[PDB]
Structure formats: structure tokens, C-alpha cells
Design a protein around this nucleic acid. Structure first.
Ligand SMILES: [K+]
Ligand SMILES: [K+]
Ligand SMILES: [Mg+2]
Ligand SMILES: [Mg+2]
Ligand SMILES: [Mg+2]
Ligand SMILES: [Mg+2]
Ligand SMILES: [Mg+2]
Ligand SMILES: [Mg+2]
Ligand SMILES: [Mg+2]
Lengths: 372, 88, 253, 218, 260, 254
RNA sequence: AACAAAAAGGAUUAGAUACCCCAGUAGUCUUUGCAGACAAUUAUGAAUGCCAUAGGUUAGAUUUUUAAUUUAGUCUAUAAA
């Protein structure tokens, strides 16, 4: 019954703009700044592009054409729109290269994302048919639920004392009746197990008496109870009797849609030298030197801890442009908060020399001149 | 804490002192000279370097005025859009 | 299937829903900065702005296009008014097609109600069925008062309301692009659409330009067959009466 | 009343009457304006008549004294819920630029989601996943999660090959004497140098400022 | 979207009588160009190149490494159709002006014949062999032969991806190895830093590809076979191709300055 | 919008219709982009080659040829399907129906209704009508297919004309008395629809248009009526020959 | 305790009851009554039905609680009037 004009808008490109997702979650009790805000952990608005011809006119498929002062001249045309029409009759926009190019930088490292491992390194891919699964069935047993990553219930350890009370009085309290039915289904199957077995050599599931007594038998073994309660509220397992239980489930996909590579078990064949041992190094910056009990380094837009090891010790104003060292990214993963934590590992000497050779800035060429 | 209010309809949105008011520098230098005279004394020896600094300013040429800050022009543009409107 | 300067090199005769939606002719203003009066064209609310119904735009656009055609078919003087940074090429092109007058700057208040002073020195001429000068009206082009547009086609009624008021004050029909926050009672024929878009304005103006062009064509085709689709205006008509009076004296005297 | 009495809707009525008779009683009325006959049979449309707007969602049946009856309603589709879910699971999918500038508007004519994610005219993005998800959920009678899993997994495989081509493309190109320009990584670091040096200057100045400002405390 | 277009003289339905059967031309152009374009469309389905022509994509999408994979499909589609727009249903007689100039740069029509053919087999890889017209500010128009590995653009605006030398066997420890090695790095270092090794006139008019020869496997692996026994094979494919060159059209693109 | 229209009392009936026609075209959303003319091209040509005779026997005989495999027309599927439906209806109605199609082309609108009354009055006494209606709508298709008094057209011998009987008004049924006396031979204003063959023909006999210049003539006269370009193109694909190249276009009939 | 009409002193001033100053009693406060006047004001009696929006704000409610709907108040700026 939709009108033809209303049927075109449903599939229009503008109507496809995703809603502004909540910002990257941070500690609920901090002193965040209000007037000034730095770049976020992950993007929140959709980045836009246009044709080189339509950009010279300021046409971005928006309400009105954007100004040419800050929208033309750059190589990569990227822009974010906070409001298509604000109270000032202007499209409140801003450059989107902060996050747009950071994705391109990270995708130039050629590194997959793997599930974190407690401290024999085992980098298991995130995109697998055994772990990456959201759909389920009620009949499924508790064990497979650990594999999942998208739980409907909240994380108890993460919730604040106020949020916890609200959850109890608005999600758990008005569920006793339904929970009683859930037990009946379990008790029903229990009666069928003995019958089926003896028959080799289900009931209507309506017994309000066994249920009450069934819960009094589990008061001495709280473990099996929580195991059952976690299935009715879809809570992330917390006790070892494990995966991502230290910081809780990932609010997003374990890869967070930043890289879709499954493994890095490849050897880039170099033209002259041949198949190299490790991956090409990457130059990074130095932020917050040791002399804060750790050093921060900027590896392709992201901030990660320095390798476990001058340069990191003290700051040096004389160095122009700042201290820049080469380094190899070993492992990358997404924490519960959504940040992209990189296991930056010190690079080798030959790798840097080989990689600089193509750039043409290598002081001494390994090819030919090198006698030994 | 509440957020900044939406200004009522004003005749003209502007700032009185568009450009900062520059304070005569050595008026402070004179204060130091006067201070030393109070503590040390008028016909003393430690006041030489301070008194000589006061003579240095008057001889030195005054700086040139800064370029006007065009802030009232942009405020007049977005007045009707930022506030409730204009009144007359 | 899309060139930026396609609405100028070859504007379309009629604009379909796709063309109007592709030109952002439905992006209304913010929900807060709306005019409840023109809630008859709004379709819904998305992205915090009012969505103008695509069908409502096409219907009013075709209607206005018919108005421009007839007025040009009856020898009317049309005026295309677009006063914005990037609307100069759009208005000039539309005028060429419809053989009309353009205006891409701040309309001087009092050019219709006080035309005697403003448009005093601008020269005029006298044409005929086939739009060619008629020698013999030299004395009439000095006592004649300036002209007024028989139809104004505004592309930003919200900005310039002094022009549209003189049109209603001087009994002149008008056409305008009414946005979500523009009063629809300022113009005679509304065209609910997005006026802040330089791509929709080029489309709407192109369609109206073709209308005038098609109208002018019919008029000239009917003039070559000895069928004039317009009679002498009242002003010039009076001169003929005076001409015979002065000529009558020569006959007797 | 800051407004003015507009009569743009009555230009024909007023003009038609003024041209009915002559001001000099006892003479034939002069010819009317040239536009009077052009819009004779085209009366203006009705304006300023608040109708019942289109209801895009069931109105609250419990409200006994409803307000805002003449207010346009919000447009919500079933996709909105799905788009929010997906893009929250893949926040870095928003860094992939997406053009919302329609070319001709005829982009929904060749979209058949029964084939797969890849379609004609639209790029592989979260939207294709949602539309594909919605299709499976409706036609194939799948659940929200089930349809989400299937379509989502196809999205991954298509993105993996895309990233593999880039690496293999540049690598293979150099095997036959192919050289490229400055990669994005190197360029990014260069710009930081120019910006970091500017910060050093400002820091040095303000540092010296405080030192000179500390001499006055004593 | 980029869509396949017809061939010059209805070769899709009939094909060249003595060079390629209709079936071979079908699999070579209609069933391959379509595949390449299908991939190309998916790559530029939502970028600035959604409406750009193949050549514009080639030149524009050349230096940037991140878009290397787009260059291949775009360039391949261009070169492929560039190779079919120079054949003819019947052999054409070489133009006089062209015939003369050829001898002045290669010595004879047969000298150039065996050079291009010889270069093909020498490559032992899929590539395109061109016939380029070189010109400099004061130097007269001079022709030369160029070999492009896999997808290689002969134009000077795509020098980054010229791919004229296989680094595998052309860079060793011998005297030639070191020489080739230096050039390889000299180009990379120059290109990376933005320096220009060889000045080129604006508009890329120094080099104008006149004729081409597709040596890819799919083109000839069917009609001429594997080539075991020398009967047919890649060699014969190049030979037969030399008889269908539309020398008339070749002369037109040459645009030789009147000097006779 | 139709309510806003206020015509003048001195406007001719033609003017009033013109205003509405132009107003109804303001709400046109455009014909579908994929749906093609169903009865057009081949199928349309087949209809003119099998529905020009005055006897059902000849008509069905022609369809059988088209249905027979290898027919030049290429409408075999349509032809076969059509026959299946023609052999499932009352044979009496077919003869009677076709009879008035040839006689109704010369009657007036007023005379038509008067004859149809007497014509329909004899159908109430007929057996087919009382049987078909009862066996279809009333029974809701129960008891299987209806049973016409003549089982099939084959039963009706060639030399027998059953059509004539109905076309004889009886004195028992009084002549229909209409509410007025207005009448005519052809519709006064039936030109609002898409151009048909009559319009395209007239245009060619009064002009020197080309294959592409003729389409623009109709698109201009109707000023963008949806489907004019497609309709006119179809007419020029069935009854238009390239007699003098692109210079002129003539009809195939000649 | 403090403040402070009155009474009184010191100044100012042409004169100074005054304004200013040193001090100072009723009174202000507590309990029980009288008294009933106020710019006791929103210069707008109380109450009911009804009329288009926007930006804040107060106490709640609902929700995909991020941010939007919504009930009852309050205050700015407007449309029709
Ligand atoms: K006193
Ligand atoms: K309020
Ligand atoms: Mg606007
Ligand atoms: Mg006191
Ligand atoms: Mg009392
Ligand atoms: Mg009081
Ligand atoms: Mg009272
Ligand atoms: Mg209050
Ligand atoms: Mg007020």
C-alpha cells in the first residue's frame, strides 16, 4: 500500500545512512573534557565520498552544497555529517580522514585479528564456523555457549552498582514466572531419560511440585545453578569452571570490522632477495617515554605499548620530528572496550635495511656492493 | 549542570572590545623603580640598573598597532541563526 | 548516467520522481525550523529533517510548467529570479530558452511599485507577431512607462520577500520553490522542494525553461499562419487611438 | 503583526475584475494583461489547511486525549533495527567511505537479493548485508540471528579476497619491474613531523614564557 | 557500469577466417572481456572511477599501490580490445609513407616482423607486444618495439606499471645483473621520492601505441594448441597475426609528419 | 484538485474536458519500466490476421494454423492458449457475439442500447445462459463444467445461422425508452487516450514525417503523455514500411 | 548580644528638621490576646471548554534507558489572531 514516491525513498542512498552508534565506552567515573574532544577509539559516523567533478561544486548528496574552502584540495575526500540541517540552517559536518585513513593504514599492515590468549602462542582466526556464531537454540547445552561472542545479557562484573540494581528490578525480577516454566522443561526431559534408557534394554512438563523441590536440591551446589541461570538470561560465563572473562564479552564483533584476514601464515616473496623470513617492518613514533611506567608508541595511527626492552628512556628535543623507530607488528586483537590493542615487537636490523632499499634511502645497498 | 541558554533577541550581537587593549609596558617598569626607592632608597646604588631600564623604554619606539579582529562581522551574520532572532 | 552539468547542456522536458529524488528535491529543513502552515507537502521525518513528498513536488512542478508555457504562448514577459552564490548560470540558461529576463542579484526594492524612477533610462522596443521591430513608435518609447514582468519565477522565495510582495501588490502571478520553512502564501503557484540544493534548482529551472521554449515555439508557429495569440496591450492600444486623432487633423487640415 | 497582507492567491480575481469595465464610464474596456488568459483555467492550489498527516507507525490506541495530531510522523522501516545492530558489531565499517550522491535514482531496479550480496550499482557494504538478511528472514522464514549469521559470513569472505588482492597485486607487480609511489603509511608519518615540529616551537616559547614569568614572583 | 561492446567487423559472430575461428574469438574476447569487466565493475562500483573510461582509470590508478589490483583489470581490458581493433578480415597492403618510415627505423619490414615475433617467444610469459612511436622536442619521429609484462601500459603517463623487464632472471650477479639491478632501484627510489628520471612532454605525446599483440595463453591456446612438434603453437599464432594487421589503420594512428 | 477547478459558464464542453485532461496528467507517476505492451507486435498482428472474418469457423481455422508449429508469426504459444479458452465457452454466444461486432460498427449509440435490450431479452429464454450462470456462479463451479445446448461448434452445421434469430425484436417486449434523445455515430471526445492507429495514420497522410521525427510530433502535441513514445513506436512496427528510406514513412496496407 | 524609630550629642550648611558620624530607648525575639489596614501585585478574581510552533527548565513515567516519546508545572521567542 506504499505510495510510489514512498517506495523510492525506502531504498534511497541517504536513507541507508546508519544511525549514530554509541561512542566507544569508557570508564563511567572519569573527568572527560567537554569543550574539547579528541579522536575516538572507533568511528561513529559514516564517511562519505564524491566524484572529482561533483566535489568541485560542493555537491555531496546532502541537503545543501558544502563550502569549497575546507572541502577541496585534499587528496582523499572524506567528510562526516553530524546533522544534515542544524538550528543554524547549515549541515554540521567535519573531516572524516581521521578514521577513514586510519582504516587504510591498518589494512596496509596485512595482519589478521585473533582471539586473545592467556599467558606456546596460538593465533586462532576470528572468522570460523565454530566460534563466530550468534544464533543458537534453547536445546543447546551450556558448553557451546562459551564459543559465542554476542550475548544478550549484560556483564555483571562490568555493570556499576547502580546499573546492577536497575537490571535486577527491571529485567530479572519480572521473570520468575517464565523461569519456573524453563525448569519444567528441564525436569520433563529428566523423566524421559530414565524411561528411554530402560526401554532400550516426554511428559507434558506441568509439575509445580517438583520445581519447588528441585531448586532446594541445588542450594548445596551453587555452580550447577548459575550454569542454568546463565542460559535463561544469556549471561557471559565468568568463572573458569573462561574466554574473555577477564574484561568481559566484546561489545562488538571480535574483529570489529577493521580487518577480515583469517591468517598471516604467508611469506611475501621479495623480487631480488626472495622469500623473506618475517613481515616488512613499520616505522612508529614514541609517546610518553618511560622517564607512567611504560612507553606509548604510535603504530599507524593506533597507540600501543612499547616493546619489552636511548630512545624510550628519555625525551630528546634535539631530535627533529621526534624519535621514530622501526618495529614489527606481531599480534593484533580487540579488547572488550573496542580498542585495537597491538602486540608490537621490536624489529630486526636486516628487515629495516631491506625495506628501506626500495624507498631509495638505504645508505648502503645490499645488492652487489655488499661483499660479505 | 545546565547548558548555555539560547540568547534572547538582541538588537546587535557584538563584543565591545573587539581587539585587546594594550597596556603601556614600562608603566610596570616604573612600579619597580618606585618599589626600589621605597626599600633601598632614592640616592642608592642598586637602583641604577632599575632606573636605567626606565630610561630605556621612553627612548625605544612604541610598537605598531595590530590588525583589527573581524569578529563582529561574523557574529552579525549568525545572529538570527544563533539567537531567537533580531529585535527592532 | 549522471553528469554534473547535465541540467544546463540539456535539461529535461519533465522531471520524474527519480530525477527529483536524485537531485535532493525532498530534503526539507530541520524539524524545529519548520512552518506548520506547509505541513500539507511533508511526507515524514527522517534524519531530523522533514521529507517533502516526491509526488507532491512533481504534481506542482508540472502545474507550474504549464503556467510558464501558456504565459509565454500569450506573449507574456517572464522573469527568472535566482539570487544565490551559484544560481547565476541556472537562471541565465532558463531565460535563454524561454526568451525571458534574468535576475541573479539583490532585487532593488521598488522596481515594480516605483518603476518610473528605477527603470527610467533602460531602453525598450516595439515588436509584432514575429517578434521583429516596428519602426514608427519613436514618440511612444519616451512617454511610455517602464515594463513589469507578467510572471516571476523565483528560486529562493525565503530570501527575497520584497519582490514577491510587489508582485501581489501589483497583481502579478508568481512561481516559487517553497521549502519546509518558507511561507507558502507568498507565491501564487508553489513548488514544494529543496531550495538549498543547487542540483534541484537547476532541474526545476530547466523544466520551466523548456516550458517557455515550447510555448514560444507554438506562438511563433501560430504567427506564421496569420493567427496572433495576443492582442495589443492597453498601453500601446491607447497610442493607436491618439495616432488616429493626430492623423485626423492632417486629413481635415 | 510583523507580517504583511499577501494576496498572491487572488491575483487573477483582482486583476479580472479590474479589467471587467473601464475607468471612463461609457467606453469599451481596454485589453487586459497578456497573462490573464494564460492562467485562466489554472486556479491556484489550496494552501494552509492542516490535514491528518500520514501515520508511518500505529498511533497509541490508549491515548484518550492525543496531542500533535497534525504533526508528521517519523519514518521507521524494519531495516533501521538491523542496520543499528550490524554497524554496532562492525564500527570500523563506517570508516569505509560510502557515497550517498544518487546518479539517476534508478539504483533499486537491478537489486535482486535472492542471488547474493554482490549487486549491480551498489558497493559491498553493511547495507547489502541488511537487505540480504531481511530477504532470508522473510522469504526463507529464517530467524533474525540465523539470517544475520548466513549473510554476515558471506560478507567476510568477499572482504578477505579484496584485502588479499592488494598485497598480491603490489607484490607481483614488482616481480616484473613495477614501482609505486609513497604508501599511505609513509605519507602519514611525514605529516606528523611537520606538525610535531610546530608543537616543539610552541612548547619552547611557552616554556621560556613561564621562566620569565617566574622571575617576577621573587 | 562498464559494459562489453561489439567488435570491429563482426568478428564475434564470424571471426577472422584464417587467424581465429569464431569459437576461439568468442572465448578470447566475449567470454574473457566480460569476466574482466565484471570484476572491474565490482571494484569501481562505488568510487570516482564508476564512470571513468578504462584509459583514464589506467593512467589515474597507476602510481597508487593501494589500487594496484584495479589497474590490472582496467589495463587488461584496454589492451585486449586494443589488440582486436587493429586486425582486418582481409590482409591490407602496407601504406607507402608507413612502409618507408619502417625501413628507416628497422631496416626492413621483415626485420621488424621477426623482432616482434622473436620478442614474443623470448618472453615465455603472458604479455603484450607493442609498436610505439617515439618523439622528442627536436628529434624526428622514430619508431621502436616495446614488450609489456602481464598488464603493462605503454603510455608515458603509466610509467610506474610499464613492467618491461622480468626481475626474476634479469637481476643476477653478472655484469648485466648489476646494471639491471641499479636501474630497478633507481626507478623505485626516483618514483617513490617523486623525482623524474626521464623528462616527458606534457600530455603524454612522446609515445603513441600504434599496434599491439596479445600473447596471453587464453588467446591462442585453443586454435593453435600447445605447440608440441612446432606445428602451430604460440609461434604460429604470432606469424598468422602478422598477415591480418590493418596497416591502413596502423598508418592513421602513426600520424607521421609529411617528410617525403 | 478537481474540486478547485471552477469553469466559466461560457466555456464550451471541449474546454472543460481540456482542463481536466491537463489536470489528470499532473499526477502521472510514469508507466512501469519493465512491463512491455502485452497485445503488441507479433500478438497484435496475429489478432488482425485471425479476427477479420465473419464466421467463427474461419477464425478458429486461422488460429489452428498459427498454433501449428513452425508458423511464421511466432505466436504459437498464444495461439494454442487462445484456442483452449475458445473451446470452453458457449458456442451460441460466440456466433451471436461476433455477429454484433460487425453490425455494431454502423449502429448509433442510442440504437445500440435499444437493440441490446431486445437482444438480451432473448438470452433470458435461451438455455445456455440459464445453464452457464447456474453451473458457474451459483454452484461455485461444483458439478463440473457447464453443458451448453450445442456441445461444440462442430455440432452446428455450416449452413445454419443461429445469429439471425436474436436480432429480431419481438412485439411482446416494448422498445427501450431512454431518458433523452441525444445520440451519435462515433464518440464525440474519445481522443484523450494514447494515440491509436487512426491517429498515426492521419498524421502520415497530412505530413512528411520520418521514423524518428514522427514520434516527436506526437510527443510534442501531447506534451509528455506517459507511454506515447512507446505506443507510437509500436504502431510504426506493425503498419509502417520504409518505403523511401528515412526520408518518408508509408503504411504497409497501400 | 546585635540592630534600631524616639530623645540627645558631633559635623556639614546661608540655614539642616535632615542625608553622614559617636552613642542610644521603645521595638524586632519568646508566651497569651487584641488589632485586620499593605505596590496583601501577575497593577491581570476563581473555574470550565477550546487554538499553531520552537528553545530552555522543574518532579515523574515509558522506551532499542545512548537518546527520544509523554503527563503535570514554570519561563523566554513567535504564528494565526
Ligand atoms: K543634630
Ligand atoms: K515545557
Ligand atoms: Mg531553504
Ligand atoms: Mg547603632
Ligand atoms: Mg483575629
Ligand atoms: Mg506582602
Ligand atoms: Mg472569591
Ligand atoms: Mg517556579
Ligand atoms: Mg511571551
Amino acid at each position: 500500500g506504499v505510495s510510489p514516491g514512498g517506495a523510492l525513498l525506502r531504498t534511497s542512498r541517504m536513507f541507508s545512512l546508519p544511525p549514530v552508534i554509541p561512542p566507544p565506552p569508557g570508564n563511567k567515573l572519569q573527568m572527560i573534557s567537554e569543550r574539547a574532544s579528541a579522536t575516538e577509539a572507533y568511528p561513529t559516523h559514516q564517511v562519505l565520498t564524491t566524484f572529482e567533478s561533483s566535489r568541485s561544486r560542493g555537491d555531496w548528496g546532502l541537503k545543501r552544497p558544502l563550502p569549497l574552502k575546507s572541502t577541496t584540495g585534499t587528496t582523499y575526500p572524506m567528510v562526516k555529517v553530524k546533522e544534515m540541517d542544524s538550528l543554524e540552517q547549515i549541515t554540521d559536518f567535519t573531516s572524516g580522514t581521521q578514521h577513514g585513513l586510519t582504516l587504510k593504514k591498518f589494512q596496509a599492515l596485512n595482519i589478521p585479528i585473533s582471539t586473545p590468549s592467556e599467558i606456546r602462542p596460538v593465533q586462532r582466526s576470528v572468522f570460523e564456523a565454530d566460534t563466530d556464531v550468534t544464533a543458537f537454540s534453547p536445546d543447546e547445552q551450556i558448553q557451546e555457549a562459551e564459543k559465542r561472542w554476542k550475548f544478550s545479557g549484560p556483564w555483571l562484573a562490568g555493570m556499576t552498582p547502580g546499573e546492577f540494581k536497575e537490571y535486577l528490578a527491571k529485567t530479572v525480577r519480572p521473570k520468575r514466572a517464565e523461569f519456573r516454566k524453563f525448569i519444567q522443561k528441564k525436569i520433563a526431559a529428566q523423566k524421559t531419560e530414565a524411561a528411554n534408557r530402560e526401554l532400550q534394554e516426554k511428559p507434558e512438563s506441568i509439575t509445580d511440585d517438583e520445581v519447588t523441590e528441585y531448586l532446594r536440591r541445588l542450594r548445596n551446589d551453587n555452580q550447577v545453578l548459575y550454569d542454568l541461570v546463565g542460559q535463561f538470561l544469556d549471561l557471559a560465563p565468568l568463572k573458569p569452571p573462561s574466554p574473555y572473562g577477564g574484561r568481559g564479552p566484546p561489545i562488538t564483533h571480535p574483529s570489529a570490522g577493521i580487518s577480515y584476514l583469517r591468517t598471516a601464515a604467508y611469506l611475501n616473496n621479495h623480487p631480488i632477495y626472495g622469500p623473506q623470513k618475517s613481515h616488512p617492518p613499520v616505522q612508529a613514533r614514541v609517546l610518553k617515554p618511560r622517564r607512567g611506567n611504560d612507553a606509548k608508541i604510535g603504530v599507524a595511527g593506533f597507540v600501543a605499548d612499547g616493546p619489552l626492552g636511548s630512545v624510550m628512556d628519555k625525551f630528546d628535543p634535539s631530535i627533529e620530528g621526534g624519535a621514530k623507530l622501526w618495529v614489527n607488528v606481531d599480534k593484533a586483537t580487540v579488547d572488550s572496550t573496542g580498542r585495537v590493542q597491538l602486540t608490537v615487537s621490536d624489529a630486526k636490523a636486516t628487515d629495516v635495511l631491506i625495506a628501506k632499499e626500495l624507498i631509495g634511502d638505504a645508505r648502503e645497498p645490499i645488492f652487489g656492493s655488499a661483499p660479505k | 549542570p545546565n547548558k548555555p541558554i539560547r540568547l534572547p533577541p538582541l538588537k546587535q550581537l557584538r563584543v565591545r572590545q573587539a581587539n585587546k587593549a594594550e597596556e603601556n609596558p614600562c608603566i610596570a617598569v616604573m612600579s619597580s623603580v618606585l618599589a626600589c626607592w621605597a626599600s633601598a632608597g632614592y640616592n642608592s646604588a642598586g637602583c641604577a640598573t632599575v632606573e636605567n631600564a626606565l630610561r630605556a623604554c621612553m627612548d625605544a619606539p612604541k610598537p605598531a598597532p595590530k590588525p583589527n579582529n573581524t569578529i563582529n562581522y561574523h557574529l552579525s551574520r549568525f545572529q538570527e541563526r544563533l539567537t531567537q532572532g533580531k529585535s527592532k | 548516467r549522471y553528469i554534473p552539468e547535465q541540467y544546463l547542456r540539456n535539461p529535461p522536458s519533465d522531471a520524474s520522481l527519480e530525477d527529483l529524488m536524485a537531485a535532493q528535491a525532498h530534503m526539507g529543513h530541520n524539524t524545529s525550523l519548520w512552518n506548520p502552515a506547509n505541513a500539507r507537502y511533508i511526507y515524514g521525518v527522517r534524519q531530523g529533517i522533514h521529507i517533502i513528498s516526491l509526488e507532491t513536488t512533481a504534481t506542482h512542478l508540472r502545474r507550474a510548467a504549464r503556467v510558464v508555457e501558456e504565459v509565454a504562448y500569450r506573449g507574456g514577459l517572464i522573469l527568472f529570479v535566482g539570487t544565490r552564490p551559484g544560481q547565476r548560470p541556472i537562471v541565465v540558461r532558463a531565460a535563454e530558452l524561454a526568451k525571458a529576463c534574468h535576475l541573479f542579484t539583490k532585487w532593488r526594492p521598488g522596481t515594480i511599485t516605483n518603476r518610473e524612477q528605477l527603470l527610467g533610462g533602460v531602453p525598450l522596443t516595439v515588436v509584432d507577431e514575429l517578434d521583429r521591430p516596428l519602426s514608427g513608435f519613436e514618440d511612444h518609447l519616451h512617454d511610455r512607462r517602464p515594463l513589469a514582468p507578467d510572471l516571476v519565477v523565483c528560486l529562493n522565495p525565503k530570501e527575497n520577500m520584497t519582490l514577491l510582495y510587489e508582485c501581489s501588490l501589483a497583481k502579478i502571478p508568481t512561481i516559487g520553490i517553497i521549502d519546509t520553512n518558507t511561507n507558502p502564501s507568498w507565491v501564487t503557484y508553489q513548488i514544494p522542494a529543496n531550495d538549498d540544493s543547487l542540483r534541484a534548482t537547476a532541474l526545476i529551472s530547466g523544466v520551466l525553461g523548456r516550458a517557455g521554449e515550447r510555448g514560444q515555439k507554438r506562438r511563433l508557429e501560430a504567427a506564421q499562419r496569420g493567427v496572433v495569440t495576443w492582442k495589443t496591450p492597453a498601453d500601446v492600444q491607447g497610442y493607436f487611438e491618439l495616432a488616429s486623432a493626430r492623423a485626423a487633423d492632417a486629413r481635415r487640415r | 503583526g510583523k507580517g504583511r497582507i499577501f494576496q498572491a492567491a487572488k491575483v487573477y480575481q483582482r486583476a479580472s475584475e479590474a479589467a471587467a469595465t473601464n475607468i471612463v464610464s461609457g467606453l469599451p474596456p481596454r485589453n487586459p494583461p497578456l497573462w490573464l488568459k494564460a492562467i485562466e483555467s489554472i486556479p491556484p492550489a489550496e494552501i494552509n489547511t492542516r490535514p491528518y498527516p500520514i501515520q508511518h507507525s500505529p498511533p497509541n490506541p490508549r491515548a484518550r486525549k492525543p496531542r500533535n495530531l497534525f504533526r508528521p510522523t517519523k519514518i521507521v522501516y524494519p531495516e533501521d533495527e538491523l542496520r543499528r545492530d550490524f554497524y554496532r558489531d562492525h564500527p570500523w565499517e563506517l570508516a569505509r567511505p560510502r557515497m550517498i550522491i544518487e546518479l539517476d535514482g534508478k539504483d533499486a531496479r537491478f537489486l535482486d537479493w535472492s542471488k547474493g550480496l554482490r549487486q549491480r550499482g551498489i558497493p559491498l557494504s553493511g547495507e547489502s548485508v541488511v537487505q540480504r538478511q531481511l530477504w532470508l528472514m522473510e522469504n526463507q522464514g529464517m530467524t533474525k540471528q540465523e539470517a544475520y549469521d548466513k549473510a554476515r559470513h558471506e560478507f567476510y569472505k568477499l572482504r578477505q579476497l579484496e584485502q588479499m588482492e592488494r598485497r598480491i597485486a603490489v607484490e607481483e607487480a614488482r616481480m616484473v619491474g613495477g614501482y609505486f609511489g609513497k604508501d599511505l603509511l609513509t605519507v602519514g608519518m611525514e605529516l606528523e613531523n611537520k606538525t610535531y615540529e610546530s608543537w616543539k616551537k610552541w612548547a619552547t616559547t611557552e616554556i621560556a614564557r613561564q621562566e620569565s614569568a617566574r622571575a617576577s614572583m621573587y | 557500469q562498464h559494459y562489453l561492446m561489439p567488435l570491429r567487423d563482426n568478428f564475434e559472430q564470424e571471426g577472422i577466417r584464417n587467424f581465429l575461428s569464431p569459437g576461439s574469438v568468442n572465448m578470447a574476447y566475449t567470454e574473457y572481456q566480460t569476466f574482466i569487466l565484471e570484476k572491474l565493475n565490482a571494484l569501481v562500483v562505488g568510487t570516482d572511477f564508476e564512470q571513468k573510461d578504462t584509459k583514464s582509470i589506467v593512467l589515474a590508478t597507476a602510481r597508487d599501490p593501494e589500487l594496484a589490483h584495479v589497474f590490472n583489470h582496467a589495463s587488461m581490458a584496454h589492451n585486449n580490445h586494443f589488440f582486436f581493433d587493429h586486425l582486418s578480415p582481409v590482409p591490407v597492403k602496407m601504406g607507402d609513407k608507413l612502409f618507408y618510415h619502417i625501413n628507416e627505423n628497422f631496416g626492413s619490414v621483415d626485420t621488424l616482423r621477426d623482432e616482434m615475433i622473436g620478442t614474443a617467444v623470448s618472453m615465455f610469459g603472458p604479455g603484450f607486444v607493442w609498436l610505439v612511436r617515439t618523439q622528442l622536442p627536436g628529434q624526428p619521429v622514430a619508431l621502436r618495439v616495446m614488450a609489456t609484462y602481464l598488464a603493462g601500459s605503454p603510455y608515458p603517463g603509466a610509467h610506474w606499471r610499464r613492467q618491461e623487464m622480468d626481475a626474476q632472471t634479469s637481476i643476477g650477479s653478472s655484469p648485466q645483473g648489476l646494471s639491471n639491478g641499479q636501474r630497478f632501484f633507481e626507478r623505485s627510489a626516483a618514483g617513490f621520492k617523486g623525482n623524474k628520471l626521464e623528462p616527458t612532454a606534457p600530455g603524454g605525446t612522446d609515445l603513441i601505441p600504434i599496434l599491439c599483440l596479445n600473447t596471453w595463453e587464453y588467446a591462442w591456446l585453443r586454435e593453435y594448441g600447445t605447440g608440441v612438434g612446432g606445428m602451430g603453437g604460440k609461434l604460429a599464432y604470432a606469424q598468422s597475426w602478422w598477415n591480418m594487421i590493418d596497416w591502413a589503420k596502423v598508418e592513421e594512428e602513426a600520424r607521421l609528419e609529411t617528410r617525403i | 484538485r478537481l474540486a478547485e477547478l471552477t469553469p466559466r459558464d461560457y466555456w464550451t464542453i471541449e474546454q472543460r474536458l481540456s482542463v481536466i485532461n491537463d489536470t489528470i496528467e499532473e499526477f502521472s507517476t510514469g508507466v512501469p519500466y519493465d512491463e512491455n505492451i502485452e497485445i503488441g507486435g507479433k500478438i497484435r498482428l496475429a489478432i488482425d490476421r485471425c479476427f477479420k472474418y465473419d464466421k467463427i469457423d474461419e477464425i478458429i481455422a486461422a488460429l489452428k494454423e498459427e498454433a501449428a508449429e513452425g508458423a511464421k508469426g511466432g505466436v504459437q504459444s498464444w495461439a494454442k492458449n487462445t484456442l483452449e479458452e475458445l473451446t470452453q465457452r458457449s458456442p451460441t454466444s460466440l456466433h451471436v457475439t461476433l455477429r454484433q461486432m460487425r453490425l455494431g460498427k454502423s449502429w448509433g449509440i442510442a440504437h445500440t442500447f435499444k437493440r441490446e435490450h431486445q437482444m438480451a431479452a432473448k438470452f433470458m429464454k435461451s438455455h445456455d445462459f440459464n445453464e452457464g450462470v447456474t453451473a458457474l456462479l451459483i454452484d461455485k463451479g461444483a458439478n463440473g463444467p457447464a453443458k451448453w445446448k450445442p456441445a461444440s461448434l462442430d455440432e452446428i452445421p455450416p449452413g445454419a445461422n443461429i445469429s439471425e434469430d436474436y436480432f429480431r425484436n419481438d412485439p411482446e417486449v416494448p422498445v427501450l425508452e431512454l431518458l433523452n434523445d441525444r445520440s451519435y455515430m462515433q464518440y464525440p471526445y474519445n481522443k484523450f487516450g494514447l494515440p491509436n492507429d487512426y491517429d498515426v495514420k492521419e498524421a502520415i497522410e497530412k505530413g512528411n514525417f520520418t521514423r524518428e521525427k514522427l514520434i516527436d510530433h506526437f510527443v510534442e502535441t501531447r506534451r509528455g503523455k506517459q507511454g506515447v513514445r512507446e505506443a507510437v513506436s509500436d504502431v510504426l512496427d506493425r503498419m509502417a514500411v520504409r518505403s523511401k528510406g528515412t526520408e518518408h514513412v508509408q503504411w504497409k496496407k497501400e
